[PDB]
Amino acid sequence: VRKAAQEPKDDTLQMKVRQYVVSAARLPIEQGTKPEILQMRVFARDEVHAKTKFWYNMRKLNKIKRSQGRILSVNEIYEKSLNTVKTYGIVLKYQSRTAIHNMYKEYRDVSLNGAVSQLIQDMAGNHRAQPDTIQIIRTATLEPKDIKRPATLAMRNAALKFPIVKTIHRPSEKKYRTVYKATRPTTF
Amino acid sequence: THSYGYRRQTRKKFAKAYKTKGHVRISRYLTTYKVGEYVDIMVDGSQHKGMPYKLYHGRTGKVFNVNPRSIGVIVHRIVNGRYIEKRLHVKIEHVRPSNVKTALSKRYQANDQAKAEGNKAGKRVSTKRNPGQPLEAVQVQGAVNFQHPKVFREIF
Amino acid sequence: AKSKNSTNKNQISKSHRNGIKKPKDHRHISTKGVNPRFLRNRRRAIKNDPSIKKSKNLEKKVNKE
Amino acid sequence: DEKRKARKTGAFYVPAEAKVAFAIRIRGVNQLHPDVKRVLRLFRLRQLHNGAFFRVNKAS
RNA sequence: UCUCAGGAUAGCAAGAGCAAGUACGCAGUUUUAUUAGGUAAAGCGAAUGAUUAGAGGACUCGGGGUUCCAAGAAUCUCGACCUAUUCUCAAACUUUAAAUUGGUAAGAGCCGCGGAGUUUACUUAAAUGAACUCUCGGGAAGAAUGCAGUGCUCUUAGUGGGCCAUUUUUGGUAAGCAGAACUGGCGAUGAGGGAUGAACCUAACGUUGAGAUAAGGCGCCCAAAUGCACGCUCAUCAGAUACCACAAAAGGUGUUGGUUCAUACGGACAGCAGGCCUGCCGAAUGAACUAGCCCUGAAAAUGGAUGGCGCUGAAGCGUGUUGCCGAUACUCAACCAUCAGAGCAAAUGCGAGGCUUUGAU
Ligand SMILES: [Mg+2]
Ligand SMILES: [Mg+2]
Ligand SMILES: [Mg+2]
Ligand SMILES: [Mg+2]
Ligand SMILES: [Mg+2]
Ligand SMILES: [Mg+2]
Ligand SMILES: [Mg+2]
Ligand SMILES: [Mg+2]
Ligand SMILES: [Mg+2]
Ligand SMILES: [Mg+2]
Ligand SMILES: [Mg+2]
Ligand SMILES: [Mg+2]
Ligand SMILES: [Mg+2]
Ligand SMILES: [Mg+2]
Ligand SMILES: [Mg+2]
Ligand SMILES: [Mg+2]
Ligand SMILES: [Mg+2]
Ligand SMILES: [Mg+2]
Ligand SMILES: [Mg+2]
């Protein structure tokens, strides 16, 4: 249980993804040289986890292995303003029992970390995806001209109203909990 | 296995290496061997006499006797959870000198030299070799190559 | 009748149980596999070498020669 | 501070790598390859919930 | 071993001992140094063996059909020979060639074509060589890590039908079949979890209290969340998960995602219209795919088994997040016993197969 600072006060409401930048270099490590540095953006729940994500992708993308290189640094990135709602696009590859797939997904959230967490839960529930399998190709905070999904564009209007049609009874604290009460609740 | 005979299952071990057919290899004829040297033992298929049992091919023995056509060597075989000394006699053909001591002597002499000189200056020199060690702190100024995970594509 | 023909299962462990015994390195080794030529030489060169202490009556024999 | 000078350059500074590690035994005794057993024994974790220090070596 | 339900024989096991427990020693471990190997793979425009496709060819090796006229020449058809290729393969093929793994080593019993010796069918033309002795010169101890398992004697019990799991494997359509390899395990073994149950998961057991756990759980039977957040699902045959108690080829205008091509106020799709086009209507509308849950494919004999109740704002499927419950393991103490520490004479508050203590088990 280690929180990143930009996570909510209630741990419940969001997953423990954080967004990392990791960068490393070919091991020989020649001093005065101007090294090729390999840098990548990973989403993980740890520094360790991030390192893994890093290396996996890196050994797939290029010749390098870990005994062949060194980790220069791992730096968590944060979201600018948690005051506004943004529409995020994400581009994925994941692995389904048959084959591998490229998906584009959109979520309306306050954080790119939130965008990701929601992405994972969704991908589990609807697609039975395994986290380890998921590869996020590219992520963009979306400009309105660019938002393509109906359940996304669905929420743009000021005239938005939800009645709350059914209120399921939920006592305020536990101190108030009773199995059986002397009269029936209401919905509304 | 239904058959047990001195050469059983000797097929590819003893076949001469590619394009080795009929190589006489005069060098082995000339190699000098001494009672205490370490020999590596390697069979050649053209020379049938003084052939060791396949088990001993590629083993490292210690020389023990020297005969006119053959070097007596010493190897050990694990048998029923114990080691058993075996005195081999190899014809010159199937024997070659092992570098396992050569390395040692070369190293030692150089090292000893270093230590003697240091003893001259009051500096104790140590010859102990340390294995790979955790990397020292570093500064890095370089060009950043930013990679992104590729989309999947099928090549048919 | 039916039996299990050859299994090497428990035998490896059994062998490692008390350790693998290795013989003792003895300064002086037996003479097996050493030719008689060399051996006679050793015998002679030892008998005649004064820097090698013999028995008393032996030295008598050696000093007479 | 090294980190700071780095960050400002756009360059980065890698601290020297840990020379001391700690290990704790997660798993029980039963049913283990004899090699594994002995490796554990060398690391001096002979039971569950045993921590120890070790150097960091190609060896270790 | 006339040996196959048995015997010996090694191995495994116990007790009594020996030795300076060469720690510069030891090791089912790495590291470093020197080295082996022909398996996996791959390779057959490379050898051996198979083996498809088309074309060319000055020069070719023969057959046949064609034609002409005539026996020749011209020419269609075959293959064989190259020419440049090409399809698919080998446990009894192989150039190439791994991972895992095998030898031997990592110094005082070391290193150095420096010395002086000893050798009567040892070596050489050769004080040449060789092997051993006494010398001369140099040599911080020559990797990590661990050592509550030092080496060896002596005497001897039981055993000699095995069985299972992961991975690898051969015969077999197959089998809770028959055989093999490495490591375990079960037998010889309990405790908690898989409702249940030899070989699965945690975990290895002296008597006892506390705490925090593993495996697994927390709607009730049941300790602990009818917790807090996500996605998906309505079954007139839902579903409910390792080893585990089975389902396939094949299908669905059920529902939700995603992929690739398309339409639309220079008014689409559809319907109604009307003569390919055109009006009305009015913002979204096509097509092929893919994978989730759901539906069909899905027949058996006593009455029935996600373990049972029952569960659909889940008590279902794939996740997120926090706490809590929970072994005979882990902590901490008390007691018992085992093994090992330390201390007990001019003695003495008591018994030396003793007393006092300490750590592990
Ligand atoms: Mg070979
Ligand atoms: Mg043994
Ligand atoms: Mg009987
Ligand atoms: Mg016996
Ligand atoms: Mg004893
Ligand atoms: Mg030591
Ligand atoms: Mg090994
Ligand atoms: Mg090799
Ligand atoms: Mg595996
Ligand atoms: Mg069987
Ligand atoms: Mg295994
Ligand atoms: Mg195992
Ligand atoms: Mg029995
Ligand atoms: Mg058990
Ligand atoms: Mg308790
Ligand atoms: Mg609820
Ligand atoms: Mg039922
Ligand atoms: Mg059912
Ligand atoms: Mg159940």
Curated annotation (Swiss-Prot), chain A:
MF (Gene Ontology): structural constituent of ribosome
Subcellular location: Cytoplasm
GO terms (BP aspect): translation
Keyword Transferase in record: no
Pfam families from the UniProt entry: Ribosomal_L18A
Keyword field: Cytoplasm, Ribonucleoprotein, Ribosomal protein
Gene Ontology CC entries for this record: cytoplasm; ribonucleoprotein complex; ribosome
Family: Belongs to the eukaryotic ribosomal protein eL20 family.
HAMAP family from the UniProt entry: Ribosomal_eL20
Protein name per its UniProtKB record: Large ribosomal subunit protein eL20
Encoding gene per record: RPL18A
UniProtKB/Swiss-Prot annotation, chain B:
PROSITE patterns: RIBOSOMAL_L21E (PS01171)
Statement: the UniProt record of this protein carries the keyword Cytoplasm: no
Cystine pairs: none
Any one of the GO CC terms: ribosome
InterPro entries xref list: Ribosomal_eL21 (IPR001147), Ribosomal_eL21_CS (IPR018259), Ribosomal_eL21_sf (IPR036948), Translation_prot_SH3-like_sf (IPR008991)
Keywords: Ribonucleoprotein, Ribosomal protein
GO molecular function: structural constituent of ribosome
Region of interest: Disordered: 109-131
UniProt-listed GO biological process terms: translation
Signal peptide limits: none
Family: Belongs to the eukaryotic ribosomal protein eL21 family.
The protein's name: Large ribosomal subunit protein eL21
Native organism: Tetrahymena thermophila (strain SB210)
Taxonomic path: Eukaryota, Sar, Alveolata, Ciliophora, Intramacronucleata
UniProtKB/Swiss-Prot annotation, chain C:
Gene3D superfamilies, per database record: 6.10.140.1730
Compositional bias annotation for Polar residues: 1-13
Regions of compositional bias (Basic and acidic residues) in chain numbering: 46-65
Cell compartment(s), UniProt: Cytoplasm
Predominant place of localization: cytoplasm
InterPro entries in UniProt: Ribosomal_eL29
Alphabetically ordered keywords of this record: Cytoplasm, Ribonucleoprotein, Ribosomal protein
Family: Belongs to the eukaryotic ribosomal protein eL29 family.
One record GO biological process: cytoplasmic translation
Official protein name in the record: Large ribosomal subunit protein eL29
Gene (name only): RPL29
GO cellular component: cytosolic large ribosomal subunit
Ranges of biased composition (kind: Basic residues): 14-30
Record GO terms (molecular function): structural constituent of ribosome
Region (Disordered): 1-65
Origin: domain of life: Eukaryota
Coiled coil: none
Pfam family, one: Ribosomal_L29e
Curated annotation (Swiss-Prot), chain D:
Bilayer-crossing regions: none
Family per similarity comment: Belongs to the universal ribosomal protein uL30 family.
Protein name: Large ribosomal subunit protein uL30
Gene: RPL7
Residues of the full protein shown: 61 to 120 of 239
